[PDB]
Amino acid sequence: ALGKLQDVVNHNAQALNTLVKQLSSKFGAISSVLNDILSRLDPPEAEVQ
Amino acid sequence: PTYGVGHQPYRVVVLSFELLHAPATVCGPKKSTNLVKNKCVNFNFNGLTG
């Protein structure tokens, strides 16, 4: 019966969950963690990553 | 020995590592500090900084 309101709540929560989940994506870099990139590479290549 | 560079014998050693995906057993010379609880600190556990 109340599918429309719950649907809106679901879309908002799903969008935030997807946006949080996207932080675990390498995006073509060596790691998805910035601290690892800093702890492992020199500034010329860490800047690229 | 008479040949110039480009044909002389070269000794090559390849060091291979793995990054963070297992418990580590080879570490750097950094000294261990004491552990503190319930306080905001910048820690370094086995090369993992946070």
Curated annotation (Swiss-Prot), chain A:
Outcome of swapping residue 38 to F: In strain: Omicron/BA.1
Effect of residue 7 to N: In strain: Delta/B.1.617.2, Mu/B.1.621
Coiled coil (UniProt feature): 6-49
Functional description taken from the UniProt entry: Subunit of the fusion protein that is processed upon entry into the host cell. Mediates fusion of the virion and cellular membranes by functioning as a class I viral fusion protein. Contains a viral fusion peptide that is unmasked after S2 cleavage. This cleavage can occur at the cell membrane by host TMPRSS2 or during endocytosis by host CSTL. In either case, this triggers an extensive and irreversible conformational change that leads to fusion of the viral envelope with the cellular cytoplasmic membrane, releasing viral genomic RNA into the host cell cytoplasm.
Name of the featured protein: Spike protein S2'
The organism of origin for this protein: Severe acute respiratory syndrome coronavirus 2 (2019-nCoV)
Part of the intact protein present: 944 to 992 of 1273
Swiss-Prot record, chain B:
Effect of residue 21 to P: Increased resistance to human covalescent sera neutralization
UniProt effect for mutating residue 49 to K: In strain: Omicron/BA.1
Region (Disordered): 21-43
Top-level taxon of origin: Viruses
Quaternary structure annotation from Swiss-Prot or TrEMBL: Binds to host ACE2. RBD also interacts with the N-linked glycan on 'Asn-90' of ACE2. Cleavage of S generates a polybasic C-terminal sequence on S1 that binds to host Neuropilin-1 (NRP1) and Neuropilin-2 (NRP2) receptors. Interacts with host integrin alpha-5/beta-1 (ITGA5:ITGB1) and with ACE2 in complex with integrin alpha-5/beta-1 (ITGA5:ITGB1). May interact via cytoplasmic c-terminus with M protein. May interact (via N-terminus) with host bilirubin and biliverdin, thereby preventing antibody binding to the SARS-CoV-2 spike NTD via an allosteric mechanism.
Role according to the record: Attaches the virion to the cell membrane by interacting with host receptor, initiating the infection. The major receptor is host ACE2. When S2/S2' has been cleaved, binding to the receptor triggers direct fusion at the cell membrane. When S2/S2' has not been cleaved, binding to the receptor results in internalization of the virus by endocytosis using host TFRC and GRM2 and leading to fusion of the virion membrane with the host endosomal membrane. Alternatively, may use NRP1/NRP2 and integrin as entry receptors.
Protein name: Spike protein S1
Organism for this UniProt entry: Severe acute respiratory syndrome coronavirus 2
Full protein segment contained here: 499 to 548 of 1273
